[PDB]
Design a protein around this ligand. Sequence first.
Ligand SMILES: *[C@@H]1O[C@H](CO)[C@@H](O[C@@H]2O[C@H](CO)[C@@H](O[C@@H]3O[C@H](CO[C@H]4O[C@H](CO)[C@@H](O)[C@H](O[C@H]5O[C@H](CO)[C@@H](O)[C@H](O)[C@@H]5O[C@H]5O[C@H](CO)[C@@H](O)[C@H](O)[C@@H]5O)[C@@H]4O)[C@@H](O)[C@H](O[C@H]4O[C@H](CO)[C@@H](O)[C@H](O)[C@@H]4O)[C@@H]3O)[C@H](O)[C@H]2NC(C)=O)[C@H](O)[C@H]1NC(C)=O
Ligand SMILES: *[C@@H]1O[C@H](CO)[C@@H](O[C@@H]2O[C@H](CO)[C@@H](O)[C@H](O)[C@H]2NC(C)=O)[C@H](O)[C@H]1NC(C)=O
Ligand SMILES: *[C@@H]1O[C@H](CO)[C@@H](O[C@@H]2O[C@H](CO)[C@@H](O)[C@H](O)[C@H]2NC(C)=O)[C@H](O)[C@H]1NC(C)=O
Ligand SMILES: [Ca+2]
Ligand SMILES: [K+]
Ligand code: NA
Ligand SMILES: [Zn+2]
Ligand SMILES: [Zn+2]
Length: 779
Amino acid sequence: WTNTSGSCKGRCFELQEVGPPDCRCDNLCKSYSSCCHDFDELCLKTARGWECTKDRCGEVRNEENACHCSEDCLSRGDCCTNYQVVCKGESHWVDDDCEEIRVPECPAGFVRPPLIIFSVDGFRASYMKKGSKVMPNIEKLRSCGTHAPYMRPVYPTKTFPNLYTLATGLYPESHGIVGNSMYDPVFDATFHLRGREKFNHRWWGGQPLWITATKQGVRAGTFFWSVSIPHERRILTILQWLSLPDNERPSVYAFYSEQPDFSGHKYGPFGPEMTNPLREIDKTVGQLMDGLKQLKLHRCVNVIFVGDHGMEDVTCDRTEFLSNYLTNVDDITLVPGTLGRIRPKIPNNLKYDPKAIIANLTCKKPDQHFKPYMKQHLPKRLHYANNRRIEDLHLLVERRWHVARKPCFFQGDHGFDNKVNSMQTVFVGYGPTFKYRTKVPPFENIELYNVMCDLLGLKPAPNNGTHGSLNHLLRTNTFRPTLPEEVSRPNYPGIMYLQSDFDLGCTCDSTEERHLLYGRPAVLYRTSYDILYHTDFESGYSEIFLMPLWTSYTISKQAEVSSIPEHLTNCVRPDVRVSPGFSQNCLAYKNDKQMSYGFLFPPYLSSSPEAKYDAFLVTNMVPMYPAFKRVWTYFQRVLVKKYASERNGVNVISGPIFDYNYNGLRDIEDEIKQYVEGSSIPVPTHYYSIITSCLDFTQPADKCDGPLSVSSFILPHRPDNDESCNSSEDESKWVEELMKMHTARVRDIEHLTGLDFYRKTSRSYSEILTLKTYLHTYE
Ligand SMILES: *[C@@H]1O[C@H](CO)[C@@H](O[C@@H]2O[C@H](CO)[C@@H](O[C@@H]3O[C@H](CO[C@H]4O[C@H](CO)[C@@H](O)[C@H](O[C@H]5O[C@H](CO)[C@@H](O)[C@H](O)[C@@H]5O[C@H]5O[C@H](CO)[C@@H](O)[C@H](O)[C@@H]5O)[C@@H]4O)[C@@H](O)[C@H](O[C@H]4O[C@H](CO)[C@@H](O)[C@H](O)[C@@H]4O)[C@@H]3O)[C@H](O)[C@H]2NC(C)=O)[C@H](O)[C@H]1NC(C)=O
Ligand SMILES: *[C@@H]1O[C@H](CO)[C@@H](O[C@@H]2O[C@H](CO)[C@@H](O)[C@H](O)[C@H]2NC(C)=O)[C@H](O)[C@H]1NC(C)=O
Ligand SMILES: *[C@@H]1O[C@H](CO)[C@@H](O[C@@H]2O[C@H](CO)[C@@H](O)[C@H](O)[C@H]2NC(C)=O)[C@H](O)[C@H]1NC(C)=O
Ligand SMILES: [Ca+2]
Ligand SMILES: [K+]
Ligand code: NA
Ligand SMILES: [Zn+2]
Ligand SMILES: [Zn+2]
């Protein structure tokens, strides 16, 4: 119970912990209905608006006013933000020319530059194009500070998952907020945007910035604001907090605006009606900077201007209905809109038939505007499966469309695949720790938690950022990364056997400098493997998993594609370097009527026939479904060369991935669940390829002087091509479309393989970390 009869005198927006039976005066009290009876009258003053006028300058201090224009207001830290402009002849911050802030210019008492996070909901990255005509203050922050052309949110591209990701550095599947709405089958309880269930701490995992700060003795302002508190009051409160005594003043602050998300939904992102909310936000930014300038803090504070996701054109007329596909939609619950999650209406309903539902949802209309996925089949880049709150059945909805259960106020929405252009949001950093007038490549919001920790002198809790990959955004306070140490050193075995030693059922009728350009990948777990050299490729062959962990080769721009001769079609030769006991056998493949096999280094690209024979080794062989082989062969035969021609050579590294429990991490042997029939050859869940070349395309891959260029993929190893609706046609009609959807970061592959790439290069380790987090989106 809360004794509401208490008072908020001298307590407005206080930062100290206060809980029942005591009554509260913090920015969250309304949300708990636990405010003192006089909170509104004493703390939410509104009288006379938010701006000084000339007829108010040097007034007698009246406590009834929202903000003040009296002589003493400055030291007391509660002037209206435009006080000195109206009353003391000063200029607005936005009318001042930019000057590089080479070091913090903070008043005495300030040990570190404070950090203010200014988050805007639904701010599409492309809104920034509207420039200073519409958003002069924001434009100044962007042009004078450090900005990215856009920032990639996490999927689903909705508010709660993204704000909590920002706060924690974690994927939703890790922090637990996997949607604005969700059902937890263990709680048997439902979380909603609106309502009280969300206030239960049991939903919220990881460790958000404010907790990290607090636990390391750094004071945080309260990040959250009750929706009824006007933005002008949030700003004044932050400014007041910054005016607090040295022993009370917080170091990190957060402002939040629900705009332009609201207007985006109502009018769509390209509506002329969008200009007005963008103007309002800029005005609020202006109040903040005017306020900091008045406090002599405008060259002391680090400001981060950041969105949670973008906004797409979505109207009533573009809605798919499950009732068009399924007979009994009243028996399922659908989490609807710009994504789909399906479960039975009655939890654990035994008649629920997901294979049948998926079958009715698969490629049933030629223009079908969604695609069903078992969650383990979703592109790995989304990192959206390893949580009990994520339904097994998912629908990835096409941009601009909605999915509903069964049969216009809105013109905009968001939620789609996070590589979609319209979902990208904004990042600008301005202040002494950020660089001056610097543009940086786009990056993912999971990286920001580490940077904010760096900005505040904190040690980050475990998270999914790659600490160091964003050092290039900072003047100082950078993080010196250290290379992880190799766990398993490789055997280099010479010949120890002869062809006569092998009973496998197989019948056949200066490498490094040229094929391993960035050093060998380090193995970061306990295991046993052999380096194998060949004329055209090198490989790290695992004696445990009976295949390479990686095969590495370089294809020159001018290199030639050859065929596999008819008599070599089914040729597999044993490898005298590797024990018969540590080899696969072709008999398992003959017996397994469903599983075929493939080669990591493509015979099609060997230099000479004597080299071709290297490719057919039993140690270059991997288990592949015929369905997948359609994809792989086309990749090996047509695409690698096309990449080599367009990029002036490519270095390729390919290999298997085992992720049977879909946690995005390298499986241990115990977790692998499928083997080639009658054998112990484990079946990969995915195959990756990492394609690297020179950023300066005028130099060949093998002779690159400077920065690298990378694209990668993690292809699902599946027994059919159901995901590809046009798979019945020629591979030139569908394979690349599939590969684009499964684009990936090198970092993703590192998590899934336990390997560490690019250890030997001429680049800084920080620059390399940036490279590993890059995602080629094809947008
Ligand atoms: C992204 O980055 C994150 C953070 O680094 C990584 O996630 C981590 O993964 C590791 C490895 O699996 C996990 O370690 C295991 O920890 C458990 C117990 O850990 C408990 O305490 C810690 C610390 O306080 C909490 O962070 C954990 O919180 C999880 O569970 C709670 C309650 O359900 C939930 O509220 C949180 O959101 C979070 O859930 C997420 O993780 C769990 C798995 O823990 C997952 O089931 C869920 O769906 C969410 O994904 C938790 O309360 C410990 O028992 C394990 O021990 C194992 O190793 C020992 C070795 O001695 C074995 O003997 C034993 O048998 C186990 O195998 C692990 O140490 C860690 O929890 C987890 N952290 C978080 C916050 O998720 C991701 O892997 C990264 N992703 C990628 C792709 O890189
Ligand atoms: C709820 O709040 C009121 C006001 O703070 C409390 O009233 C005070 O109670 C003490 C002790 O009984 C009196 O001596 C004071 O005169 C009261 N103060 C005022 C200004 O009313 C009340 O005690 C609280 N109710 C509880 C504790 O249940
Ligand atoms: C999948 O779609 C088929 C139709 O394509 C559904 O079967 C129809 O509905 C009922 C129940 O099976 C039958 O009486 C009709 O004869 C079927 N119509 C046709 C055209 O065959 C089936 O119900 C759907 N499956 C699910 C799980 O929704
Ligand atoms: Ca795994
Ligand atoms: K076979
Ligand atoms: Na198909
Ligand atoms: Zn949002
Ligand atoms: Zn929204």
